[PDB]
Amino acid sequence: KVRDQEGRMNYYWTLVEPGDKITFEATGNLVVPRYAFTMERDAGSGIIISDTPVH
Amino acid sequence: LFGAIAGFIEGGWTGMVDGWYGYHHQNEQGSGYAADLKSTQNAIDKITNKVNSVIEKMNTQFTAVGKEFNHLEKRIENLNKKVDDGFLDIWTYNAELLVLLENERTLDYHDSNVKNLYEKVRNQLKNNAKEIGNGCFEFYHKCDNTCMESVKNGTYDYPKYSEEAKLNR
Numbered sequence: 653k654v655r656d657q658e659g660r661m662n663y664y665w666t667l668v669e670p671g672d673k674i675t676f677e678a679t680g681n682l683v684v685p686r687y688a689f690t691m692e693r694d695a696g697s698g699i700i701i702s703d704t705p706v707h
Numbered sequence: 708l709f710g711a712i713a714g715f716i717e718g719g720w721t722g723m724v725d726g727w728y729g730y731h732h733q734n735e736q737g738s739g740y741a742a743d744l745k746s747t748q749n750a751i752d753k754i755t756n757k758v759n760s761v762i763e764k765m766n767t768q769f770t771a772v773g774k775e776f777n778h779l780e781k782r783i784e785n786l787n788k789k790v791d792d793g794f795l796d797i798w799t800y801n802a803e804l805l806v807l808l809e810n811e812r813t814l815d816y817h818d819s820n821v822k823n824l825y826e827k828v829r830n831q832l833k834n835n836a837k838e839i840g841n842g843c844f845e846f847y848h849k850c851d852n853t854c855m856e857s858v859k860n861g862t863y864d865y866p867k868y869s870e871e872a873k874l875n876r
Contacts, residue, residue, distance in 0.1 A: 696771060697769075697771050698771035698772070698773050698774075699773075
């Protein structure tokens with residue numbers, strides 16, 4: 653039991669290119685997307701784990 | 708090490724703030740400190756260039772040091788730790804040794820400048836003056852303010868006071 657849940661939920665992600673398509677087929681056990689994120693990405697950066705305030 | 712600063716000139720001057728090296732003159736009209744404009748300016752420019760070379764030659768790129776690895780990638784995490792520590796070690800050693808060597812170079816540069824100034828004055832005066840030992844010359848003739856600013860400029864006139872110096876020797 654985690655959070656009073658015996659079952660589990662795996663989460664998957666994918667990136668769809670311009671012009672491509674994503675197809676979902678399901679007899680059951682599927683948590684469908686409701687919101688997708690249109691993104692254009694930069695060169696690259698990091699993630700900072702700190703409690704320092706933001707100014 | 709050219710044996711000037713702490714060598715045959717065993718002290719520095721605190722009343723001389725207009726330069727790094729120069730002269731102290733005592734004649735009948737007065738006494739005073741004066742900087743050597745040429746040597747001071749050249750030294751200032753050279754040291755400025757030195758500092759700029761040490762600082763600005765370091766090129767950097769946008770980096771994101773720090774990555775996140777889950778428990779099943781303890782080998783890539785260790786490799787990343789190795790990359791980081793190796794760089795840290797290299798840069799520490801390089802920085803410390805560069806500063807240690809460059810400080811030496813700067814101090815001997817200043818010593819060389821003082822010695823060269825002393826040599827220039829000595830070769831200008833020749834036997835018209837005498838060396839007392841602490842970096843000073845006692846004139847066998849009478850050097851007024853004009854003669855002194857001639858010495859501090861490189862335009863001394865040995866065959867103008869040669870006869871008087873010979874008489875007073």
